[PDB]
Every structure is written in C-alpha cells, then in structure tokens.
Design an enzyme around this catalytic site. Structure first.
Site, PDB file in Angstrom:
ATOM      1  N   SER A 197      -0.492   2.905  -3.224  1.00  0.00           N
ATOM      2  CA  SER A 197       0.687   3.507  -4.341  1.00  0.00           C
ATOM      3  C   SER A 197      -0.363   4.335  -5.178  1.00  0.00           C
ATOM      4  CB  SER A 197       1.127   2.086  -4.956  1.00  0.00           C
ATOM      5  OG  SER A 197       0.824   1.049  -5.136  1.00  0.00           O
ATOM      6  N   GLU A 324       8.694   0.158   3.209  1.00  0.00           N
ATOM      7  CA  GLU A 324       7.850  -0.010   1.809  1.00  0.00           C
ATOM      8  C   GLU A 324       9.315   0.030   0.168  1.00  0.00           C
ATOM      9  OE1 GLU A 324       5.084   0.825   0.447  1.00  0.00           O
ATOM     10  OE2 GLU A 324       4.366   1.537   2.368  1.00  0.00           O
ATOM     11  N   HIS A 437       5.137  -3.886   0.830  1.00  0.00           N
ATOM     12  CA  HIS A 437       4.018  -2.457  -0.374  1.00  0.00           C
ATOM     13  C   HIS A 437       3.371  -3.546  -0.807  1.00  0.00           C
ATOM     14  CE1 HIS A 437       3.226   1.036  -2.922  1.00  0.00           C
ATOM     15  NE2 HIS A 437       3.678  -0.066  -4.103  1.00  0.00           N
TER      16      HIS A 437
HETATM   17  C1  LIG Z   1       2.215  -4.615  -7.781  1.00  0.00           C
HETATM   18  N1  LIG Z   1       2.527  -4.898  -7.073  1.00  0.00           N
HETATM   19  C2  LIG Z   1       3.375  -5.386  -6.287  1.00  0.00           C
HETATM   20  C3  LIG Z   1       4.243  -5.362  -4.912  1.00  0.00           C
HETATM   21  C4  LIG Z   1       3.587  -4.554  -4.660  1.00  0.00           C
HETATM   22  C5  LIG Z   1       2.667  -3.508  -4.452  1.00  0.00           C
HETATM   23  C6  LIG Z   1       1.558  -3.409  -5.355  1.00  0.00           C
HETATM   24  C7  LIG Z   1       0.299  -3.077  -6.196  1.00  0.00           C
HETATM   25  N2  LIG Z   1       0.068  -2.980  -7.828  1.00  0.00           N
HETATM   26  O1  LIG Z   1      -1.032  -2.271  -8.049  1.00  0.00           O
END
Ligand SMILES: CN1C=CC=C/C1=C/NO
Ligand SMILES: *[C@@H]1O[C@H](CO)[C@@H](O)[C@H](O)[C@H]1NC(C)=O
Ligand SMILES: *[C@H]1O[C@H](CO)[C@@H](O)[C@H](O)[C@H]1NC(C)=O
Length: 529
Positions: A197, A324, A437
């Site tokens: 992300s 996602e 995600h």
């Molecule tokens: C913080 N977070 C919460 C749900 C899924 C992915 C995620 C990535 N954070 O960096």
C-alpha cells in the site's frame, strides 16, 4: 567476529538471531539520519554524522510518532499493525538481516512499509526479515520514515516544512544502503525496493522521481501504485490542510513562518489527536498527510510522466489481493461490523458508495451504482456488501495499479503481475472480508514456516513458493528459474497469474471490465459535468 562491521559512518556491532534450525546475524537500529527532533521537525532529513566507538545494533529502534488503532483493543487481527516499540520523533533507523556465514556480494532487498502515510513500523513481527534472509540467502533491510504530519505536512513556498519529507527519509536510507551494504555482504548493483500500500505507492514514486532512480535496480509493488487517488495531493490542497491543522490547535495563521513555529511547539500527540479533522470530505480510504506533487520531488504531474516514459526503466513485479476493499469498509462504512456478516441495506449501500467516491457529483454516483448493482435482485444484502467491497477495491487499488501497469509497460524492461487470492486458514478476521488488503505480506515474509503459528502444510508450500519468486526476481529480473512459468505481462495480451495453494493458472485482463469504467469512462464524465 561475523558480527562487527565497518561502515563509512562507523563500526557497528550486531547480534546473532535464531531461525528455524540454524542462525543469522541481525543489525538492528542503525541510524541513517540526524534525529529529526527539536525543530528539524518537518524539515528535510540530514545525513547521520559518523559516530566514534561501536554502535549497538542489537535491539529494535523506536517507532515514529503515529496514530495508534484502538477500534478492536486486544484483537490480534488489528494489533498486529500497531507500533510495538516505544514511539519517538527520533526514529530514523534501519535494520539488516545477513545470512551466516556472511556472503561476499549477494542480492539486497529493501522493505518499505505501508500504513496509509499516517502509520507503520519497521519492527512489527510480520515484517521480520530473518526468514527471507535465511531461506533465500539475500540481504534484507527494512527502513523507516516519518508519517502523518511529521512526515508530510507541506507548506510549499517555505523551506521550513516543504513537503515529501518522509519520502526523503526513504531516499536517505536508500543512499546509506547504496554506500554501505557491501560491508555486510550485499551487492549494491542489485537492490530491489519492495513495499505494500503506501509502501507500494512509495516504490512507484521513486521510480518516477529523478533523484531516486540511480539508488536501486528493480522494484516489487504490492497493492499500491504511485498513481492511487489516495497517495498524493496538489500543493494547494496540502497548503489548505496544513493551515487547517493550525486551526484546531489555535495557531496564528499569519505567516507560514508562524504556523510552523507553532506546530513545532506542540507535543507530538496533539498533532496526532486532530490529524483526522483536516479531511476535506466525508470519505474512506483517504488520508490527511500525503505526498504532495511539488514539482521538485515530482518534476511534473504523475499522469504526464507516465505518459511520456519519464521514469526509471527497469523491470517490475506487482499485484493486488482479491478483496482489497473490506478492511476499509469495516472501519468506515455504516452497516459493517467485525462480528456479523454485514448484510448491507439498499440504503447503506448508497451511503457506502457516496463515501468511496467523494469527489463524484451524483450523476457520477449513478454511473457507479448502475455499474455495480445487481438490478435483478437490487436488494440482496450480501450482494450489496460484496458490491461495495469491489467498488472500494477497484477504485482505490486495482484499477489505478492497472493503469500504472499499462503505461509502465510501453517503456519498461519486463513486467510480472499476480493476483493473490488465498485466504489464510488461520486468518483471525471474519470470513465475509475474504482475502484482505495486507494479508499476503505474511506469506512474502515467510511466517507459514513457523509451526507454532499454525498454518497448513500447503500454506508453507505457498509461502516458500512466493518467497522464491520474490527473491529470484530481485536477483534476476525474472521470477522464474532457468527451466511452469510466470508469463510476462504485455500490452498485447496481458497475462497475469493466480497466487494460491493450488497449481497456478495464467489469466488475462485483470478486472478489465470495471477498470475501463474507472479509468476512462468516469473521469471523462466528471470532466463534462
Ligand atoms: C494497517 N493495515 C490494516 C489492514 C490491512 C493492511 C494494513 C497495512 N498497514 O501498513
Ligand atoms: C548494548 O550492548 C550489549 C551487548 O553488546 C547489550 O547489553 C545490549 O544488548 C545493548 N543494548 C542496547 C542496544 O540497548
Ligand atoms: C530489456 O532488457 C535487455 C537489456 O537491455 C533487452 O535486450 C531486453 O530484451 C529487454 N526486454 C524487455 C522485457 O523489454
């Protein structure tokens, strides 16, 4: 000793960790910039200044100041992302995991973390690099950079808080890796930056930024693209939001000069406490402080850079997970909850849609509804839950990344695309959320290898299978070994693969259907009205 290393900045002494049956050496918390405390706050980072004596590389460093997620307190599913070390404005460090015995010149992988630009840490357990390092004999480094306002507050004209500064922290660590990774056995001709992300969007962004290109070889991007609508703003908008921050702290908004002196006076937590108020829109999947399109980091607009090959041409591997959207809807949308199946009314769908496409007028809104509604059953609660998961998915991750891919591969030097759709057998979030995600990361970092976290047999298979793919591509520009194969993605055909515990299938034109919706049609429509 294996554990004492001489580097351009000083001697560093690490520590040696256990992994599976063997061992490895770990260097934890090497500083690579002057701590941005005091009123280096918001300023661009400066280089470390060589130390004398032996730096202690044996405990994890601090985490940067960030919003801490309390929504499900004690729930591991959510806690796994929270800072797990003490928080401090002093947090520019990085970590290395070197095989034993030390290689001489092997592949380097730099991990950059996600977290919406307002959060994240090098130190979380799911980013433990010892498995990768060990299993694939690669040098693994994780960097760390400033988030939220500390990292992205941006008051254009001014040298005091110019913007993109967290983005600079990342580059500064990439500099230090470039110059010193050879003393740990890493080949600097051969670093791969890889992230998730916001981490993915940042990798994308250093492909584009000219002062970043020469610092690395190859890039892997998960669930993230530098062109995602939540990943950058205009300088005007950043200006607007910074002054808005100033307001809920009652600063003087007379010069930039004074805004900054004010914001610099405040304790870190009071910036954090109000950070979410500056949003312009009631929305989901949008964040306060964010890369700004300043013209110095990014010479020009994202879109036209993409258009004319103005970017590093190497080879890239990237991908999306099957759901996602869910994680975002759960946190942000009326109707969803951790403990029910979250059937959404035709009423809640409407407001769901509204929150996901906050810049659309309502003609835009209808166009979306039309596109994602089952008109022959426009009331089925499940179908609405899911339809919404795909709207948030498509509009925010899958389709902007597809667009990035299409432009990238006109001028790129090889492109590989995955669709990860495996739901981990022990996933602790409910079922309705699917392949969420962020949840490939644990396969990438090789946690299914550790028996006491409870994975299937085949999951471990899938994990090493992924890890090899990743490490091979970093080392090679190809995920495949010299002699079945992950095909290259081309504009003509557009093949991509499924990543999951059964034997891989190649498919074509990932969500092409809906991406033409988000990529051509909607944007034209908002432009006319
Ligand atoms: C913080 N977070 C919460 C749900 C899924 C992915 C995620 C990535 N954070 O960096
Ligand atoms: C300092 O060094 C020694 C071992 O070299 C040890 O007590 C401790 O792990 C280190 N402390 C840190 C980095 O906080
Ligand atoms: C890119 O890499 C090489 C080396 O410059 C070139 O000959 C090659 O065939 C290119 N391949 C792709 C995937 O565009």
């Amino acid at each position: 000793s294996e554990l004492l290393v001489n580097t351009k900045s000083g001697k560093v002494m690490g520590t040696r960790v256990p992994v599976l049956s063997s061992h490895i050496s770990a260097f934890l918390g090497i500083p690579f910039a002057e701590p941005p405390v005091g009123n280096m706050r918001f300023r661009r980072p400066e280089p470390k200044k060589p130390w004398s004596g032996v730096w202690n590389a044996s405990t994890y460093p601090n985490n940067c100041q960030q919003y801490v997620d309390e929504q499900f307190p004690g729930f591991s599913g959510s806690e796994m992302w929270n800072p797990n070390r003490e928080m401090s404005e002093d947090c520019l460090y990085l970590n290395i995991w070197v095989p034993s015995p030390r290689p001489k010149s092997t592949t380097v992988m730099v991990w950059i973390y996600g977290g919406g630009f307002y959060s994240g840490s090098s130190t979380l357990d799911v980013y433990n690099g010892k498995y990768l390092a060990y299993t694939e004999e690669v040098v693994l480094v994780s960097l760390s950079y400033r988030v939220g306002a500390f990292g992205f507050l941006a008051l254009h004209g001014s040298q005091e808080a110019p913007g993109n500064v967290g983005l600079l922290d990342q580059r500064m660590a990439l500099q230090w890796v470039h110059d010193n990774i050879q003393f740990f056995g890493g080949d600097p001709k051969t670093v791969t930056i890889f992230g998730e992300s916001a981490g993915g969007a940042s990798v994308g962004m250093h492909i584009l930024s000219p002062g970043s290109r020469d610092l690395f070889r190859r890039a892997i991007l998960q669930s993230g693209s530098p062109n995602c609508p939540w990943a950058s703003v205009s300088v005007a908008e950043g200006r607007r939001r910074a002054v808005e921050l100033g307001r809920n702290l009652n600063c003087n908004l007379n010069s930039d000069e004074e805004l900054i002196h004010c914001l610099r006076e405040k304790k870190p937590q009071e910036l954090i406490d109000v950070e979410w108020n500056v949003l312009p829109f009631d929305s989901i999947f949008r964040f306060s402080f964010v890369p700004v399109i300043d013209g110095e980091f990014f010479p020009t607009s994202l879109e036209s850079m993409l258009n004319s090959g103005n970017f590093k041409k190497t080879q890239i591997l990237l991908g999306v997970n099957k759901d996602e959207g869910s994680f975002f809807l759960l946190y942000g949308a009326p109707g969803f909850s951790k403990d029910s199946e979250s059937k959404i009314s035709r009423e809640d769908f409407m407001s769901g849609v509204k929150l996901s496409v906050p810049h659309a007028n309502d003609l835009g809104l209808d166009a979306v509804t039309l596109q994602y509604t089952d008109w022959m059953d426009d009331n089925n609660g499940i179908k609405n839950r899911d339809g919404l998961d795909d709207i948030v998915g498509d509009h925010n991750v899958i389709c902007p990344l597809m667009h990035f891919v299409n432009k990238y591969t006109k001028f790129g030097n090889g492109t590989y695309l995955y669709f990860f759709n495996h739901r981990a057998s022990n996933l602790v979030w409910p079922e309705w959320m699917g392949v969420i995600h962020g949840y490939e990361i644990e396969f990438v970092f090789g946690l299914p290898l550790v028996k006491e976290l409870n994975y299937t047999a085949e999951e471990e298979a899938l994990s090493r299978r992924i890890m090899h793919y990743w490490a091979t591509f970093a080392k090679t520009g190809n995920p495949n070994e010299p002699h079945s194969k992950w095909p290259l993605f081309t504009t003509k055909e557009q093949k991509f693969i499924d990543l999951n515990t059964e034997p891989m299938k190649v498919h074509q034109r990932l969500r092409v259907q809906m991406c033409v919706f988000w990529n051509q049609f909607l944007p034209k429509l908002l432009n006319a009205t």
